[PDB]
């Protein structure tokens, strides 16, 4: 166990670690998504215009433009997943979805102390489109909850 | 390398062929039948895997050292010689004829 | 055993001039060590032709011109590794063995040399699990 | 061990039966965990239950825990042929061997009976050309296991050279003993009849095997 | 009326193999830019002073050279560079 | 599906040394702890030690801390979660009452406050610390016997005697045969020889036809037997079908 | 589909050479690596070499190190092998051999017509 | 250097083989710097193998596929054309040369 | 009306449907906005790199380009607006600005049980950015509010 600005350091550093421990290291993977591995000892000025000639448009100019939109082209879709499950600018989010034993029949200890994630999203590896739906039916389902609360409410 | 076992053996049309072939040291083992004019046809290749166009009359099977290949439902169409393919080695060959 | 000029010999540039070296030298074989009382062994000279039309990716890419660099040349290399190939067939079982030839054609297998130690994998940051935590009024009493 | 469990303890089938742990302050109970292994002597334990509430994977919620003050127990409900074994408790921390319970052995009452299956062999040519002749029965297939041996050559009791083993338990969740006689081939031929007869609940079936009768 | 539910984690620590596009990042300690390099263009992003290698314990992860897409990436790049650099050069069908 | 397999069984000296070993397989070696427990000869069960393949933290209970040596290999990785591995445990100066089964057996967590505490347990290892030499197992074949001849079954076996010290591993027709077999126990005679019997319960009617082996073995003093058992009985027992 | 079309089998005397071509289509003909392996009477079918027509690299069987030369104009895509110090029993028909895939030589599902040489 | 969101995983086992389990990896969003080289039989200005000298192939029975050695200890190799080349401009318009 | 499961599928299946209806297929309109119709009998690998070649400066290289940054220069804004609303991750977003009579005067279910969407947009298609306006107003005389209050607030 290190410290919190270690932390901030370790991308993927609780991969190999238990799934309760993993939860300190959030936003580290997090921040990766869009700015990819942090740098520490040094921070170079990362500003705009350093292309002064026509090499926008050859190999690793493409190239470039392409890893750069990709990374915020997956980023939206994991951010707007989250959002129509109604967890935006959540790390942690609660759901109404109850779990089901078919997903998995392990108790918490089982797996927060037992699992790495990818460990246990591998078992999870098939049930899981099934419970985005659900996650997203259930948001619907709470929309609606809304409207007729709102017809009621004169 | 390879003991394309058996010998040689030709029966009719109705009896199911087996031919076997054992193994030196591990490698993919692959099949080929030498019908009058043609090439040899790929059969069966990676042991259980049939080729482009090969029916479910021919069958591979077996674990470890030996490899089987199987026919029902054979055919004058069925006839020429066949032969056991490991890397660049191949085997003595078998053969169903009139 | 034969091929294209840069596939049986050793090839590269030095500051741009593109060289052809025959490593027959390298591969007589000398392979029992006596050492001959630390004689006979010094540098070991390779011939080298030197070629300036150049085509490389054979027919993706156009042919290229070398220019030619003025006045004599060297470049010192590190040899830090081989490319290799088997003869293989049939042969005396005992006590009978198997020979190795140089090879160049792919250079795919220069950038396997290199790149062997790493490999890119994607992350999958969203994660779903269990717990006895429900949604609106409620977080298991409070 | 220090931490003392119950010497034995019996349950009816389909009922309950629990089982106590306890020692002095030091190994129970507050601020000490509390196990539970079924140990089926000869064979490798159990887990049964661990953070005394909890309960290993795949296990029954027959088997249900709970430590107090002073003591740590164990109930074990729906009761089975299977639950005839030896339990143990244990005392640990969460950087700290376990301190293992006394033991507690389990007999669950109100069960079918069975009689035991006797197969008396002879001795061999390899065994008579030694010379050195013995005799091989063997009971199985029994339940309850209290069961006392009786071997006869002529209807008498013999002593010397006359060795038995103790009941063990099977697969089949009946108990198994066996029994010889030593002896040599000039004895074997011969003393009249030699009866492998054994006992259980009254019923003292038998099995015999002589070379004249 | 339930005891478990389905909670979301966003940054957990998880990957799965992938082919993706590759950018260069180059040393930059090329300084002349009038001798420029065919395959340290310009376009290459400048180095991280400290490559920052993050060491995952207890990871244990299976590898193959001989499928890996980074080589064939790497080959085409190498082989895209060197047309594009004599792309501008002058011709000598002349001769 | 994990799995841990102890050493085969050792005859020593009193006062003498001993490494017992525990080849794991099926789950990560380094994630979980190795425990020591030995089944006491009037003592019962008894805890020794454990340690971590991953830190090589250790603990020894105060009886044996300067008695025994446990220690470790490094883990072979077979797939991303499993990995094979090997642990030990060696206690010199061997006294007498060591005597008994010893176990390895793994943690049940990776973190929470039963990590180390022993879940999966392995087969177990008897160790024998005596003065007494070894002995061999004089392998006989038992004959055909009919307990209920009314239906025609009947029972075949091999009679292990004269033989020390403890255990012996019995099998049938080269390890194949699986159905009707049973393996009765032992106990110590006046000499302190051991002798056990193997059934395989099986009818009168396949025996001209069908092969029956008892492969019987002693690792103490390293005995391999094989033997026929031979289709015969002159005896009013058995000779009532025919 | 590819298919490999070759030459007419030519008729010889020991003690001479022979060049039979096999052109290819249907695929690229640098990627894959094409084999000959010729059938004489009652033998199992005799791999000669391969070879690589990226940089002509080539691996010769060992009894025909020495007589043996497989080379390929990459330009018409044509495949060429030639033999000297002939004999009676080399004598065989001739099949240009590729591949199933290019990350495999061995399962020879695309074989050319047969060229039947005779000496 | 992959895109964000992305990363390479690095071997840092010293007697590597290419393919199967790694012991100890380690994350990194960049290669380290990997000269192109293009040459032929020897393998110039690369990494050396930190164990021992290592031979690396897909299947080393399959003779069809390269086997490709890593030295442990470099072996220098110094070329050269000794001659003094003097150079001309030949010139064919406009200023094409 | 259709199931849960259903619902997910039904992109823009609520158009002809009245408005109060709509509330259930927020989220399945939404998910459009970035990753167009949502795919059900068949989920194909969309990964990234595909482009083997130079293709990435052709027509369709270009023109792919082009689509998918729009998709997602379009969604931001429509984000960015919620949010300086104060209604970020909200489907549903209550305001603190009244509704106006010259706006529509239509009662709840003279709207909600009556109109659809785009026909409700139509009417209120004049005053809209208007509306705008007052949201973003309204959010910023919350933010001086605050201000106001940390100011007391010692
Ligand atoms: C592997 O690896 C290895 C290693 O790494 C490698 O090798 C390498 O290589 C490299 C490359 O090639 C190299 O480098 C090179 O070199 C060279 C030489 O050097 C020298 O000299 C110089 C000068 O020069 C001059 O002289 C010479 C002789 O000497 C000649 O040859 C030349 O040509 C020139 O001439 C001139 O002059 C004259 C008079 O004299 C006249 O006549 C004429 O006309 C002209 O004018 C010098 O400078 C140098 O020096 C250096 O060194 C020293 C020591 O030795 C020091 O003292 C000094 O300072 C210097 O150093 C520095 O740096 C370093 C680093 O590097 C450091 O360490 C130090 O400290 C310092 O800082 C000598 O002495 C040269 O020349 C070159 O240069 C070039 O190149 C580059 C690139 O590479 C660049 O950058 C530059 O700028 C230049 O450029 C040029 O060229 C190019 C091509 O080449 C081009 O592209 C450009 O554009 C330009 O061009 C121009 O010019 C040319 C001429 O030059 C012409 O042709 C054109 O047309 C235009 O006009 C470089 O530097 C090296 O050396 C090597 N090394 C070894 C060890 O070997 C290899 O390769 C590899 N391999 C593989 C396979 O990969
Ligand atoms: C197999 O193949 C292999 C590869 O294919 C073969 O490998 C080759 O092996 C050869 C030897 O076997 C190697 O040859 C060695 O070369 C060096 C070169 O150093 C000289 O050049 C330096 C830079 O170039 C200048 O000089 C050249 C030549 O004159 C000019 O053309 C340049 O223009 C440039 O000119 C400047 O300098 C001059 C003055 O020299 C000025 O007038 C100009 O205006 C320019 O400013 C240069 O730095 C060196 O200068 C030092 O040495 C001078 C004397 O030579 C001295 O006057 C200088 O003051 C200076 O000394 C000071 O500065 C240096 C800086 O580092 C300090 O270290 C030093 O302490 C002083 O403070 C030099 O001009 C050459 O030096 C070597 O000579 C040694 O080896 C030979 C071997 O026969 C010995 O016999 C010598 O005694 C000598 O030993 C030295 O070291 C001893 C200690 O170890 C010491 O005790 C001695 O007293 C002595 O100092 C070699 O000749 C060749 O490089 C190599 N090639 C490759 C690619 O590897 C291999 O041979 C082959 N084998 C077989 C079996 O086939
Ligand atoms: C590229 O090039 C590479 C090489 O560089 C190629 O790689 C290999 O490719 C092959 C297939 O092409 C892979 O598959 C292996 O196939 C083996 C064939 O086994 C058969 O033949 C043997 C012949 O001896 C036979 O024993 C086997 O049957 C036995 O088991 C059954 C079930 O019990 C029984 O019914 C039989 O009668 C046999 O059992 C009797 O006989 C035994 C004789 O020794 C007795 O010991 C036994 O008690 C009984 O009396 C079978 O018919 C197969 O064996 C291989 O299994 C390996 O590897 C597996 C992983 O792939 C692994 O899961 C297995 O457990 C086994 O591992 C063994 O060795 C390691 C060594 O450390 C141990 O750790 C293991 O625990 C295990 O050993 C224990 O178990 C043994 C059996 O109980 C026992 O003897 C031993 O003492 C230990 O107790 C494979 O399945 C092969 O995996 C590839 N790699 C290698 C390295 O070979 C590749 O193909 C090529 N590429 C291409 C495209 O071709
Ligand atoms: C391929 O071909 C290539 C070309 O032929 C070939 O390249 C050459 O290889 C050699 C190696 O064989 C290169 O290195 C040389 O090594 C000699 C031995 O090095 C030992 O000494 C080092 C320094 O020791 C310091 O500390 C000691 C502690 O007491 C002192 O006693 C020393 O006096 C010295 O003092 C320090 O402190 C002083 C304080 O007052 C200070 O002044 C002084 O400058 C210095 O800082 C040790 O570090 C080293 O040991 C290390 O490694 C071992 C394990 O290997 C560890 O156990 C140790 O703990 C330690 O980590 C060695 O014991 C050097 O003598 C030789 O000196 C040159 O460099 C020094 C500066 O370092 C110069 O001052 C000096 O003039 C020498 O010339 C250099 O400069 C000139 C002018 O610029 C230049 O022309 C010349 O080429 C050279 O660069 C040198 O370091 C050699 O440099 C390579 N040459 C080239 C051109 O590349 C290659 O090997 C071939 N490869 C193959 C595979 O074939
Ligand atoms: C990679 O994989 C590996 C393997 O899976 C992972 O390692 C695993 O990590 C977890 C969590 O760190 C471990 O669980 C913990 O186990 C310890 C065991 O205690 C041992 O160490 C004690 C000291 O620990 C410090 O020192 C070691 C170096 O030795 C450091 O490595 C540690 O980090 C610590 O800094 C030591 O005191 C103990 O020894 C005893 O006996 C010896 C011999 O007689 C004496 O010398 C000692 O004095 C002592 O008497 C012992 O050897 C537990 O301590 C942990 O329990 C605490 O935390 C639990 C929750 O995590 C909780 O349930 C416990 O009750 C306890 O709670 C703490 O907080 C309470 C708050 O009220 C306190 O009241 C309480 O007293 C206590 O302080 C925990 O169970 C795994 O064992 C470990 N796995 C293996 C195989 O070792 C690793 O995490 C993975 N990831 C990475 C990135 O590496
Ligand atoms: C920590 O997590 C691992 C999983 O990675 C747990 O191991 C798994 O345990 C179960 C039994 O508890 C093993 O078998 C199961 O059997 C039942 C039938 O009896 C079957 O229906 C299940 O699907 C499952 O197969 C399972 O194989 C095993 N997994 C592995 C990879 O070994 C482990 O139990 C957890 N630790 C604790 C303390 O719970
Ligand atoms: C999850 O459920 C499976 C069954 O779906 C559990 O398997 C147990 O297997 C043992 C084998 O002896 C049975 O006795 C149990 O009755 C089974 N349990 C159930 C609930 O059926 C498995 O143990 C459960 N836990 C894990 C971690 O997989
Ligand atoms: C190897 O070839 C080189 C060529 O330079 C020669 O000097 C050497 O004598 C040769 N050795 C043998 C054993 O042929």
């Known amino acids: 166990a290190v410290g919190m600005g270690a932390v901030l350091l370790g991308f993927l550093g609780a991969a190999g670690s238990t799934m309760g421990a993993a939860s300190i290291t959030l936003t580290v993977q997090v921040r990766q998504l869009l700015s990819g591995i942090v740098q520490q000892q040094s921070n170079l000025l990362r500003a705009p215009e350093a292309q002064q000639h026509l090499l926008q448009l050859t190999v690793w100019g493409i190239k470039q433009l392409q890893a750069r939109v990709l990374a915020v082209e997956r980023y939206l879709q994991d951010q707007q997943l989250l959002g129509i499950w109604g967890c935006s600018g959540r790390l942690i989010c609660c759901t109404n979805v109850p779990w089901n034993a078919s997903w998995s029949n392990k108790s918490y200890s089982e797996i927060w102390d037992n699992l790495t994630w990818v460990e246990w999203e591998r078992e999870i590896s098939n049930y899981t489109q099934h419970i985005y739906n659900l996650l997203q039916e259930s948001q619907n389902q709470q929309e609606k909850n809304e409207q007729d609360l709102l017809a009621l409410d004169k | 390398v390879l003991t394309q076992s058996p010998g040689t053996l030709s029966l009719s049309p109705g009896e199911t062929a087996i031919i076997s072939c054992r193994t030196s040291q591990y490698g993919s083992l692959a099949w080929y039948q030498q019908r009058p004019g043609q090439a040899p046809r790929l059969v069966i290749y990676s042991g259980s895997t049939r080729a482009a166009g090969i029916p479910d009359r021919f069958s591979g099977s077996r674990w470890g050292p030996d490899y089987n290949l199987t026919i029902s439902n054979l055919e004058s169409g069925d006839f020429g010689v066949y032969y056991c393919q490991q890397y660049e080695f191949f085997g003595q060959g078998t053969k169903v004829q009139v | 055993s034969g091929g294209d000029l840069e596939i049986t010999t050793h090839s590269f540039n030095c500051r741009g001039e593109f060289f052809y070296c025959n490593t027959s030298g390298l591969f007589n074989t000398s392979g029992l060590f006596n050492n001959n009382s630390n004689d006979s062994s010094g540098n070991i000279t390779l011939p080298c032709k030197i070629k300036q039309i150049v085509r490389m990716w054979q027919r993706v890419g156009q042919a290229m011109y070398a220019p030619p660099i003025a006045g004599n040349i060297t470049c010192r290399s590190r040899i830090t590794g081989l490319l290799l190939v088997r003869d293989g067939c049939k042969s005396n079982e005992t006590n009978g063995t198997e020979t190795f030839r140089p090879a160049g054609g792919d250079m795919r297998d220069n950038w396997r040399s290199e790149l062997y130690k790493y490999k890119v994998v994607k992350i999958k940051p969203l994660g779903v699990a269990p717990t006895r935590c429900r949604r609106r009024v409620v977080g298991r009493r409070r | 061990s220090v931490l003392t469990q119950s010497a034995s303890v019996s349950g009816s089938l389909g009922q309950s039966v629990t089982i106590s742990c306890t020692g002095p302050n030091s190994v129970c109970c507050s601020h000490k965990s509390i196990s539970w292994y079924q140990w089926p002597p000869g064979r490798a334990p159990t887990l049964i239950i661990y953070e005394d509430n909890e309960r290993a994977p795949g296990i029954s919620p027959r088997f249900s825990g709970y430590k107090s003050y002073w003591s740590a127990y164990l109930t074990i409900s729906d009761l089975r042929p299977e639950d005839e074994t030896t339990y143990y408790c244990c005392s640990y921390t969460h950087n700290s061997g376990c301190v293992f319970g006394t033991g507690t052995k389990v007999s669950v009452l109100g069960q079918s009976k069975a009689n035991p299956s006797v197969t008396l062999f002879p001795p061999s040519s390899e065994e008579l050309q030694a010379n050195k002749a013995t005799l091989v029965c063997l009971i199985s297939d029994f339940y309850p296991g209290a069961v006392t041996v009786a071997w006869k050559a002529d209807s008498s009791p013999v002593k010397a050279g006359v060795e038995t083993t103790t009941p063990s338990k099977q697969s089949n969740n009946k108990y198994a003993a066996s029994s010889y006689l030593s002896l040599t081939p000039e004895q074997w031929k011969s003393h009249r009849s030699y009866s492998c007869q054994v006992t259980h609940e009254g019923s003292t079936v038998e099995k015999t095997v002589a070379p004249t009768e | 009326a339930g005891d478990l539910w389905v909670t979301v984690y966003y940054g957990v620590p998880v990957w799965e193999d992938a082919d993706t596009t590759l950018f260069c990042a180059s040393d930059a300690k090329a300084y002349s830019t009038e001798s420029h390099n065919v395959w340290a263009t310009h376009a290459c992003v400048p180095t991280d002073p400290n490559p920052q290698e993050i060491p995952l314990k207890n990871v244990t992860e299976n590898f193959n050279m001989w499928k890996n897409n980074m080589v064939e990436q790497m080959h085409e790049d190498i082989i895209s560079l060197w047309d594009e650099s004599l792309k501008p050069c002058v011709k000598l069908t002349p001769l | 599906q994990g799995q841990l397999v102890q050493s085969g069984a050792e005859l020593k000296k009193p006062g003498a040394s001993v490494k017992i070993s525990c080849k794991t397989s099926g789950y990560r070696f380094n994630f979980y702890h190795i425990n020591w427990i030995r089944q006491t000869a009037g003592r019962g069960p008894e805890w020794m030690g454990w340690?971590?393949?991953?830190?090589?933290?250790?603990?020894?209970?105060?009886?044996?801390?300067?008695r025994v040596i446990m220690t470790t290999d490094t883990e072979v990785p077979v797939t991303s979660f499993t990995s094979t591995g090997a642990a030990y445990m060696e206690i010199r100066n061997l006294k007498f009452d060591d005597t008994g089964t010893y176990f390895c057996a793994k943690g049940l967590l990776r973190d929470g406050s039963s990590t180390w505490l022993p879940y999966l347990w392995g087969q177990g290892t008897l160790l024998t610390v005596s003065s007494a030499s070894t002995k061999g197992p004089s392998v006989f074949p038992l004959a055909p016997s009919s307990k209920s001849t009314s239906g025609g079954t009947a029972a075949l076996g091999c009679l292990v005697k004269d033989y020390f010290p403890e255990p012996v591993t019995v099998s049938w027709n080269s390890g194949a045969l699986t159905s009707g077999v049973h393996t009765f126990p032992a106990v110590l005679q006046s000499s302190g020889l051991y002798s056990l019997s193997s059934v395989v319960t099986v009818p009168s009617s396949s025996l001209g036809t069908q092969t029956y082996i008892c492969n019987v073995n002693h690792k103490p003093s390293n005995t391999k037997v094989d033997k026929r058992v031979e289709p015969k009985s002159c005896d009013k027992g058995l000779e009532v079908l025919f | 589909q590819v298919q490999l079309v070759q030459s007419g089998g030519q008729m010889k005397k020991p003690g001479e050479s022979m060049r039979i071509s096999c052109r290819a289509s249907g695929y690229e003909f640098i990627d894959c690596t094409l084999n000959w392996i010729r059938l004489a009477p009652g033998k199992r079918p005799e791999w000669m070499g391969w070879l690589k027509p990226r940089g002509g690299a080539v691996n010769y069987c060992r009894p025909l190190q020495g007589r043996v030369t497989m080379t390929r104009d990459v330009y018409s895509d044509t495949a060429f092998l030639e033999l000297r110090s002939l004999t009676v029993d080399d004598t065989a028909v001739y099949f240009c051999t590729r591949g199933k895939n290019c990350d495999y030589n061995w399962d020879f599902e695309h074989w050319g017509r047969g060229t039947p040489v005779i000496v | 250097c992959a895109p964000a969101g992305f990363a390479i995983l690095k071997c840092r086992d010293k007697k590597f083989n290419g393919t199967g389990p790694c012991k100890n990896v380690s994350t990194v969003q960049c290669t380290h710097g990997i000269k192109p080289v293009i040459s032929t039989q020897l393998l110039l200005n690369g990494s050396l193998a930190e164990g021992d000298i290592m031979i690396r192939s897909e299947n080393i029975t399959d003779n069809a596929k390269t086997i490709i050695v890593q030295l442990k200890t470099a072996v220098n190799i110094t070329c050269t054309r000794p001659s003094n080349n003097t150079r001309k401009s030949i010139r064919f318009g406009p200023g094409q040369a | 009306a259709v199931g849960m499961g259903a619902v997910l599928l039904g992109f823009l299946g609520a158009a002809g449907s009245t408005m109060g209806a709509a509330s259930i297929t927020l989220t399945v309109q939404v998910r459009q906005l970035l990753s167009g119709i949502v795919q059900q009998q068949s989920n194909l690998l969309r990964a990234p790199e595909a482009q083997q070649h130079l293709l990435q400066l052709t027509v369709w290289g270009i023109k792919q380009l082009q689509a998918r940054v729009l998709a997602v220069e379009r969604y931001l804004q429509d984000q960015q607006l919620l949010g300086i609303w104060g209604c970020s991750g909200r489907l549903i977003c209550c305001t603190n600005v009244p509704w106006n009579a010259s706006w529509s005067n239509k009662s709840y279910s003279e709207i909600w049980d009556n109109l659809t969407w785009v026909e409700w947009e139509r009417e209120i298609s004049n005053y809209t950015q208007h509306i705008y306006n007052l949201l973003q107003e309204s959010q910023n005389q919350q933010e001086k509010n605050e201000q106001d209050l940390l100011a007391l607030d010692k």
């Open positions: 340690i971590s393949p991953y830190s090589g933290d250790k603990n020894l209970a105060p009886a044996f801390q300067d």
